[PDB]
Design a protein around this ligand. Structure first.
Ligand SMILES: [Cs+]
Ligand SMILES: [Cs+]
Ligand SMILES: [Cs+]
Ligand SMILES: [Cs+]
Ligand SMILES: [Cs+]
Ligand SMILES: [Cs+]
Ligand SMILES: [Cs+]
Lengths: 367, 367
């Protein structure tokens, strides 16, 4: 008899890594063709994004099945650990098989391999269930539809870390000046070759800041959560799926625009991605408020001390993104500056959120 | 006042991702030049490996400093969370700055940037300490050199997951057949194009199996650990550093050998990597046995029930690697088959380890 906490943490890390594999082809796509071939590049980008979304949803369904499986199975052991490793190895083949099926939809080998992988996952899970039932001491006490908050938190942390570190990984792997180019194309100057990669550094800064603030909101929310429901799970899944598109948005934004309208369009896309990623968390919070009596702590109830604080912490990014989208639509001249000032201020607001909330409450107090 | 468990888990995930960034250039190096340029490719590979080792050690020192910092700081808050995000962002620049300094050792800008990043990390940590001391309620009770087992476990899990998923990530990103090549170079056959990528699938299978079994040994060990020391931390750091070289070893092994001696050499390299990765864990276990009274549970003491079991679970891989190295040295004809049979059996031994241990104890019993 052994504790299964670390095994489930490792499984969550593996699944979070496997769910964000189809987002690398997205971030590795050309920022622009520079040869008036925008149509084909956008076609391929949209196809890759759809494939990423579908693979993420499938891996999340698998992760939920795993969480239920190990919720009915309390304690683990050596054999159960090896079977869980086998299940993870089987799940690792879902993205490849799905991409193969969607790329060759005419030949039946792709769907065959996909169904084979699914049946293998199911068979491993059934073997785990059988081993757990043959040894009743490996079952939960209640055995001898709320999700597990620990698994949700671990999955979200892994996804956020990967999405925040994608760009720095790409930089460290690829954007390192080489002596030849440094002293040939930049006239013997390292500072020039480093400044040439300024846009990527700024994109990484912005993506990391945004992802970290979203994770901060998520962590402040789930600190007052008692029972995670399946609707909250779906909403968090959608939020995490739309969070993987922040690196691409920032890459496009930091890229030099061929025409002034492309800058506005890219800012709109980035603001929409952020708005979705944050409004899904806000929807999770509202669905929790629906049954706060059995979903949230008394501190964030209707009338608590940290209720308005959490409201604002979760509605800051959606409101800012909506205002930026409007400025892009209505003003259309000061949109980039507004977006940059939002990027620079939202962190400051998160830091001084309590003072601003108090000031606003005092403003509504005597008015 | 908020719990800092999830914040430290996120920090550990980020640091584990940042520590394994310099291993991607290693796995992305050409398996062979095929033009009799082995010398230059091996030079670059060794340089990349040394850079990876140094960056891993530096990031591990930073992670240890962070663990001590948040061991003296018990509880966290919003400001502390934002400062920890800033510290992580600063640490994320250590690999890039170190590679820049080691690539341009003549110009002082690289070492300048490295020292600037180090001083920024130090300043963020000092600000965290000051904020924690100005608010005594954020300090540990003992405040108002054993490491923290949770941080070690999380870091190890992240490293193992990344090292196990590197190859499947590369496959899903790169080794997906395209219709044009499929129906042009393979004469209209998808199964042929898929079998053409068989070596990479086998390499991923082997790497995942080995990394998962090493993680299984680590998880069985740290389940009986009470107090992790700094020597055990150094040994685990070395083990994790040498674990990142398993993907490259398996890539080289699965690659077709130009001459029969290159196969033996690659098998020797793989066996040596595995031997180091496992013997460092064995050394950690022995250093724990040294002070078991305050480092291990009574179950794995000298004379316990699970003592020999853990001995064998930790000494299985080193002994197998040593036997394979010998076979490469002495036999030199059946070395590849022996290595493959070890790869296929070590999992079976882990599964049936208790029965084999009992059989061996009965063999020493009546003999
Ligand atoms: Cs966790
Ligand atoms: Cs993780
Ligand atoms: Cs990655
Ligand atoms: Cs953890
Ligand atoms: Cs991790
Ligand atoms: Cs990762
Ligand atoms: Cs990776």
């Amino acid at each position: 008899i052994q504790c299964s906490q670390r095994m489930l943490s490792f499984s969550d890390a593996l699944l979070s890594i496997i769910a964000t594999v189809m987002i690398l082809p997205v971030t590795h796509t050309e920022i622009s063709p520079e040869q008036q071939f925008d149509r084909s590049v956008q076609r391929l980008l949209a196809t890759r994004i759809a494939v990423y979304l579908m693979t993420f949803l499938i891996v999340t369904v698998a992760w939920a099945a795993h969480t239920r499986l190990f919720q009915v199975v309390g304690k683990t052991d050596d054999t159960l650990a090896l079977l869980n490793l086998a299940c993870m190895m089987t799940i690792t083949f879902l993205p490849y098989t799905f991409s193969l099926m969607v790329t060759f939809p005419d030949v039946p080998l792709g769907i065959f391999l996909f169904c084979v992988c699914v049946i293998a996952i199911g068979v491993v899970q059934a073997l785990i269930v059988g081993y757990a039932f043959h040894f009743p001491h490996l079952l939960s006490p209640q055995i001898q539809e709320p999700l597990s908050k620990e698994r949700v938190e671990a999955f979200s942390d892994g996804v956020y870390a990967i999405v925040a570190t994608l760009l720095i990984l790409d930089i460290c792997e690829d954007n390192v000046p080489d002596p030849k180019d440094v002293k040939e194309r930049f006239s013997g100057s390292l500072v020039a070759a480093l400044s040439a990669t300024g846009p990527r550094f700024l994109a990484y800064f912005g993506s990391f800041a945004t992802v970290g603030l979203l994770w901060f909101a998520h962590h402040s929310l789930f600190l007052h959560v008692r029972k995670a429901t399946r609707a909250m799970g779906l909403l968090n899944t959608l939020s995490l799926a739309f969070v993987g598109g922040l690196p691409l948005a920032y890459q496009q934004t930091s890229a030099f625009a061929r025409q002034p309208r492309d800058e506005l369009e890219r800012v709109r896309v980035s603001c929409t991605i952020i708005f979705l990623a944050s409004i899904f968390q806000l929807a999770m919070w509202t669905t929790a408020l629906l049954h706060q009596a059995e979903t949230l702590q008394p501190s964030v109830w209707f009338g608590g001390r940290e209720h308005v604080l959490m409201f604002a912490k979760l509605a800051l990014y959606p409101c800012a993104s909506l205002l930026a989208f409007a400025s892009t639509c209505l003003l259309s001249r000061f949109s980039v500056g507004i977006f940059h000032l939002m990027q620079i201020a939202v962190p400051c607001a998160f830091l001084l959120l309590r003072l601003l909330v108090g000031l606003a409450l005092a403003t509504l107090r005597v008015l």
